[PDB]
Amino acid sequence: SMMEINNTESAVGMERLKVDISALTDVDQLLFNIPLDIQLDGPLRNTLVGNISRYYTHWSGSLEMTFMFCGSFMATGKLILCYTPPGGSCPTTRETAML
Amino acid sequence: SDRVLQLKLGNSAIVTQEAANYCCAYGEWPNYLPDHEAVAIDKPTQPETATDRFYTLKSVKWEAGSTGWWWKLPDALNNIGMFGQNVQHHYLYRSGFLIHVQCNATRFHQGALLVVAIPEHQRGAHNTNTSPGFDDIMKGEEGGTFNHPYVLDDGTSLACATIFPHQWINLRTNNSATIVLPWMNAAPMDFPLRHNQWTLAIIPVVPLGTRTMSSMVPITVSIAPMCCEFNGLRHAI
Amino acid sequence: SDRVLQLKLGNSAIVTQEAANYCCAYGEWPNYLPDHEAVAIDKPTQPETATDRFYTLKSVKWEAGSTGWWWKLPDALNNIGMFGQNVQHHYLYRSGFLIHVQCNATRFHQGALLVVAIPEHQRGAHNTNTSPGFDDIMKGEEGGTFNHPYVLDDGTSLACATIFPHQWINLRTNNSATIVLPWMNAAPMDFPLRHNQWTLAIIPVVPLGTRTMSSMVPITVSIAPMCCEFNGLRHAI
Amino acid sequence: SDRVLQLKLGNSAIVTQEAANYCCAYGEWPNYLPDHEAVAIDKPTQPETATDRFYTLKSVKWEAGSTGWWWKLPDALNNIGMFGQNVQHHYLYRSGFLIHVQCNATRFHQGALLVVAIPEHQRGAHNTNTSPGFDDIMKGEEGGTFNHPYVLDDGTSLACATIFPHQWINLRTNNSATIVLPWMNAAPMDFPLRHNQWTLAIIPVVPLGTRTMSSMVPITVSIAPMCCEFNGLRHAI
Amino acid sequence: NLIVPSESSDTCSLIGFIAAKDDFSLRLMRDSPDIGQIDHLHAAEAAYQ
Amino acid sequence: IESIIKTATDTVKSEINAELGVVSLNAVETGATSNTEPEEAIQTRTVINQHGVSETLVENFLSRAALVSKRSFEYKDHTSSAAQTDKNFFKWTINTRSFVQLRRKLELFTYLRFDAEITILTTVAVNTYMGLPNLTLQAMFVPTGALTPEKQDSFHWQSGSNASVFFKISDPPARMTIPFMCINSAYSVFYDGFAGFEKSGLYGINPADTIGNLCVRIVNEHQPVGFTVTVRVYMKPKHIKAWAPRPPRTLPYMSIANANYKGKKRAPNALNAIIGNRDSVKTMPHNIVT
Amino acid sequence: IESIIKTATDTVKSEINAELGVVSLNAVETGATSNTEPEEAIQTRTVINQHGVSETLVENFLSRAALVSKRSFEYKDHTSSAAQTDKNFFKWTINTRSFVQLRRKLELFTYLRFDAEITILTTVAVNTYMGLPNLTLQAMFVPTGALTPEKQDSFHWQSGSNASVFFKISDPPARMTIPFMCINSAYSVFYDGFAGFEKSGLYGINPADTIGNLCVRIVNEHQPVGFTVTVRVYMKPKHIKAWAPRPPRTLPYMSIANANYKGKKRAPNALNAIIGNRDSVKTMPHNIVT
Amino acid sequence: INFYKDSYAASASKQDFSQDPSKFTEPVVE
Amino acid sequence: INFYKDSYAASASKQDFSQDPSKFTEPVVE
Numbered sequence A: 001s002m003m004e005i006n007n008t009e010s011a012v013g014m015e016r017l018k019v020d021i022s023a024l025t026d027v028d029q030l031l032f033n034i035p036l037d038i039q040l041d042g043p044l045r046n047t048l049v050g051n052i053s054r055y056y057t058h059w060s061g062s063l064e065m066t067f068m069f070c071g072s073f074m075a076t077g078k079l080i081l082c083y084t085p086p087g088g089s090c091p092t093t094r095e096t097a098m099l
Numbered sequence B, C, D: 001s002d003r004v005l006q007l008k009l010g011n012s013a014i015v016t017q018e019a020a021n022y023c024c025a026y027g028e029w030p031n032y033l034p035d036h037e038a039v040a041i042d043k044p045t046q047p048e049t050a051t052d053r054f055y056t057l058k059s060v061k062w063e064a065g066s067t068g069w070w071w072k073l074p075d076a077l078n079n080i081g082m083f084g085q086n087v088q089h090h091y092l093y094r095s096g097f098l099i100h101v102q103c104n105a106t107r108f109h110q111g112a113l114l115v116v117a118i119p120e121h122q123r124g125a126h127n128t129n130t131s132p133g134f135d136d137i138m139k140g141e142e143g144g145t146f147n148h149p150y151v152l153d154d155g156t157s158l159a160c161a162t163i164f165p166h167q168w169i170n171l172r173t174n175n176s177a178t179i180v181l182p183w184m185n186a187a188p189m190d191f192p193l194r195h196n197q198w199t200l201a202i203i204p205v206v207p208l209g210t211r212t213m214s215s216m217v218p219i220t221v222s223i224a225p226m227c228c229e230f231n232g233l234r235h236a237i
Numbered sequence E: 001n002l003i004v005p006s007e008s009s010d011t012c013s014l015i016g017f018i019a020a021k022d023d024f025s026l027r028l029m030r031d032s033p034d035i036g037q038i039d040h041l042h043a044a045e046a047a048y049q
Numbered sequence F, G: 001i002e003s004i005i006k007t008a009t010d011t012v013k014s015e016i017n018a019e020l021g022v023v024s025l026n027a028v029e030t031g032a033t034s035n036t037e038p039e040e041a042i043q044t045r046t047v048i049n050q051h052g053v054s055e056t057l058v059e060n061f062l063s064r065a066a067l068v069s070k071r072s073f074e075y076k077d078h079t080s081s082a083a084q085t086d087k088n089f090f091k092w093t094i095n096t097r098s099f100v101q102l103r104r105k106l107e108l109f110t111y112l113r114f115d116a117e118i119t120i121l122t123t124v125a126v127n128t129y130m131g132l133p134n135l136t137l138q139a140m141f142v143p144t145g146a147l148t149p150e151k152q153d154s155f156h157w158q159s160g161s162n163a164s165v166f167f168k169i170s171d172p173p174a175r176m177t178i179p180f181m182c183i184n185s186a187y188s189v190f191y192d193g194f195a196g197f198e199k200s201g202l203y204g205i206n207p208a209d210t211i212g213n214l215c216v217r218i219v220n221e222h223q224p225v226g227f228t229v230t231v232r233v234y235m236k237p238k239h240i241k242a243w244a245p246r247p248p249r250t251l252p253y254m255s256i257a258n259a260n261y262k263g264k265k266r267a268p269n270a271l272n273a274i275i276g277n278r279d280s281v282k283t284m285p286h287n288i289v290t
Numbered sequence H, I: 001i002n003f004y005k006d007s008y009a010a011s012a013s014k015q016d017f018s019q020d021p022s023k024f025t026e027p028v029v030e
């Protein structure tokens, strides 16, 4: 079910359920990040996994994140989607997150 | 393999070839009502090819500030063809549906369509305690437009609407959605003029966008009733 | 069949789907050092998924007057992740490599990339008798740029560099090259800070060209060390 | 037979020959985490000889008014060698420990060392309601000094600390203690930077005494992590 | 890079999904913090009439 | 394929994949969820997973006894009270929609078939204090639309055929199981239509899904002093079959008669912002500071 | 070697030993306890020892129901009371550390896995006397960190999914079993670390080891007079597995948040003198006078 | 335990561990 | 006797007479 990754102001209603990516002129650039505690409020809360989990306190198990690209057929590009196990801060550069 | 699709019902046929592997709602195919679930004891009419055939609705213009479109079943079809005549001449109704939603554009267009069939889409009104009236709910063949599709016009969520039987029309990948709906009611049959078992919702999650020549992009809904039964024959209502 | 490709190593995965059937260098797959070729008698550490995983470098901007890019292995990875820590804490090193070079553009872009892995690319300097210094050769993760890629910066030839393990990224056909390198040394293991077994060279034989909207086209290098061995554990150098 | 002892782990070896028959904590030897107790589903790195090897700490001066010394594990080793690098690059940690505490003196010296490994040594502060801070607990390789070792700095007792895995270094009998610690946690693995499973405590129950030439008598702690596992590979913290 | 031609829209969207896998488990059932009330709802008094 | 699941699934160990052919990349547009296993995404170990799944059973998820009705009334002499007041008795049309914790849990489904275990707690407060009377109460189950009593000493309380339960305040709470009563095989938690043949009926309300009426009086004649008597009704669904799950309610409920929505004024759970805001999509809300 | 022990061991008769070889003299420095038998030390007789060992079973040693919480509050009208006061309700984060008899017994171990049998005794006293009201109380189990009610008539008391127990003062005490709840296989009785990724977290407190919250209200509306209502919570650990025994607490406990110590001012149980003093090491403290 | 004559009177039936999540996660035909 | 459906609900289990004191009294190897 759809993550509300664009939980920002000016993103109004349905705009919150998509992340707009643009052409960039610098390499290795961060596009978005997602906080991962399904028991908390954030992009995962109003999901089917999020809402049922918040009837519970304890949770185990793997999650899957599926991203659908919704540009045109002619749109090309490569992304890297990194999961970082906890410990320190959220990685802000690509060479830190791909570890 | 998943793209090529051929849909022949009655005298109607649809070849979609940019499809994405059709949705059978809850893994259930439409059937006739069996004798161990039947209630109404008169012999039903099962018109077969007279009703079990694709009914194309009026197309809607997919536009930049569009919110969404909904059609309620059987209400969108209760006045069309021999399905509408069997609806108007019988008290009881039972069928499944084959919904085929069609929207193509160029390879330079972007846009995603959540095409979702909602069972018992009890619509809420916004910013009032008064329930929606008959005219707000029973739109017929024209259908309605979503007011706040982000909460699916019922205070819930677009984001979790993938729990319902759905496909997507991502203009990159495909140009057609195909949902096969069975009978979805607490009762075996139903009075088709006061109750809607399914609501086809079609929602712009990603809006239509391009920088090529702006054409009218339509969304065309073809609905085939499947395994129609009609009990309680009388005069036309 | 040749286009679809799935590369899972450790916690890293790459799905390329405009690929062109990956190159195994000299038909040789990386292995661990067997006992009949082994020299160093201490038990090596084989960190497995801690090091045998894709390391993405910094992307380079494919531009109109670009000559080429080179990265030397293991030197491009000697300071990255747990591979770099095993390099810095051990005297000896042996691994293979899985190099995955990524560059896409539109269907209106033209351009060919010779993506070639050169064994023992002893670089020559131009117009001097002085050998290249340490700073000219050991660039690390940033890599270097070809000065005269037509002679491969060693007085030979770009034209005959297809004798080395290579693929092409022709922007018509594919967007990714994949070369699998084994251990390529006269010795079983090696000191990874003073010797480079492989040089990944990426060269614009046909330059980037289009008449559509000019976007930054990057070339992204992901390198997975394969079958890492490390002997001679000590303090970090 | 009990005195002679040979401890080879990785490239590290210890021959103690005035030992007193090594302690295996709770009769349990370190093992890797089995599949029926495992939680984290990624394949762990088990660096083997790169981490399963003796790490010698800084020696402490056994002096006349000494109270005691403590080191918390894994915190005393989280920045040492390839164990520290695997700690800093992984979220999860699991190992056992082989602790070898070394202190010799002459046959004219007297003194007893309670060398005790305390599981979950939650330290209390003295004469205050405020809990100990991060800087009081997480000393790292230097370790800490006991404030009131008679109550083990937690309001309990030195006298009953023989319920924990311990040996003695009585300068008459032996010059080395050897405790083998397994994984000692309620969880299968752990985040090694915020939790200490074991505290090695070394306490002067009988003080150092002699009437011969006064020499610096040191206490040397060598700790070998045993059966290291590391899950959740990422960047260095 | 996101690399589009001139007649594609230069900004493209990603829809992200999340599900749980089948190794997923939930324990300790609690009231949901996602719904609440500080009043009675409208027409709830009409159930007493 | 339908199967019996008592624990969460085991993880199998996996190795390095480098294959040109079969795919971590699926087809969203089919409406199918990603079948990508962690064995196929990362290099896994073997985990024998012994985590039970019984607490998310729909029977356990819904068979919590939840407050469905909470009615205070004056237990006193009602010779000179208003015609709105509960004059030692109230009636209550049984609904699951007045209290939002049970309402959102039941509205996670389209169809529910359950027996309703009804528990009735009665508390009494003196309106000076002389003690609490051990009062007898009558709770009479009346069907939807049927005749309910109009006074405290009504002859409708005789219960010739209506089920009544008599219970005292000193007793344990009164407890009855109401069966699955619907004329249909399930209750419609949501009803997309009118349950009447004219076009003036109520939308969203099928009286087939109404359990019935609790008509709760105090059997005792009034005391010389007044008492406030609070009756709390608890419903535990049981023998539950649930069909067609729905998106949960995100916006605050406005009414019990419908699914009308307003949202809160700001995020979270606003009309145009369900999740609370962060500064940007690359802002991490609870970033660890080091 | 692990073995089943139901009685204390028998003594075998022994004779005169005069042997040059195998040893009453052991090796302390190995950390091993002396294995010297009384047969090897003195000349013994045969004793068939029938003394049971069941009362020192850890299950029997710890499955005593012990007072863990004791909270008095005013049951009255709280229109004009302070914002600190329990206004007909209290919440309590369940701990085993507030009462020192249970605390020292549980802190004899490093790890404990037990189900918590929770018994709730309620006593009421009039704040002149007119009798004691048979009040209904609600004890609602709330998880660690979850939402607890903020007033007496809060809508969080509806308990859609929280477990609540309703009980009367005239009844036997309310009794619930809380399961072994920890995310780990045991509770950490002592936690040598921080349970947070930053360096500002609390030392010694792992919220995994917190059972949860008891939110205890009076369900009744307030009476015209005030009452003091004392709620006592009792916990009996059961199905107990205990790991890694520890030295017992000798010094008096200072706090529940930590293991901080002060000692008493003099022996016994002082910082520098745990046992009470005698005059010399050759002074016998209770010497028989003849 | 149930001493009532109606089967709906019984306690809750927390014993049905049959799952078919594929009717919601894979409601596709090919 | 236990008529509850959860096994943790049962009375205390005062029946485990297995002892291994040698893991505390003889934690030595030779």
Ligand SMILES: CC(=O)N[C@@H]1[C@@H](O)[C@H](O[C@@H]2O[C@H](CO[C@]3(C(=O)O)C[C@H](O)[C@@H](NC(C)=O)[C@H]([C@H](O)[C@H](O)CO)O3)[C@H](O)[C@H](O)[C@H]2O)[C@@H](CO)O[C@H]1O
Pocket (backbone or CB within 6 Å): A040, A041, A042, E033, E034, E035, E036, F267, F268, F269, F275, F276, F277
């Ligand atoms: C309690 C704590 O540790 N910190 C509080 C911050 O979390 C809070 O910041 C706000 O937090 C909000 C949390 O979102 C929910 C929630 O609790 O999960 C989302 C729920 O769906 C929502 N429930 C309902 C019925 O609407 C719930 C509710 O609004 C709150 O409990 C009401 O207080 O909130 C949310 O993310 C906000 O956007 C965020 O600002 C701060 C206030 O800034 O207070 C801290 O005490």
Ligand SMILES: CC(=O)N[C@@H]1[C@@H](O)[C@H](O[C@@H]2O[C@H](CO[C@]3(C(=O)O)C[C@H](O)[C@@H](NC(C)=O)[C@H]([C@H](O)[C@H](O)CO)O3)[C@H](O)[C@H](O)[C@H]2O)[C@@H](CO)O[C@H]1O
Pocket (backbone or CB within 6 Å): G267, G268, G269, G275, G276, G277
């Ligand atoms: C009761 C009696 O027959 N005789 C009393 C003497 O025993 C007492 O002399 C003092 O006795 C003290 C006893 O030690 C303990 C105990 O009761 O075992 C040690 C306990 O750990 C301690 N408990 C705590 C929580 O600290 C306990 C406690 O301090 C006392 O009960 C407090 O009164 O004491 C101890 O040995 C003293 O050093 C010794 O002087 C004399 C007083 O001189 O009073 C007699 O009634």
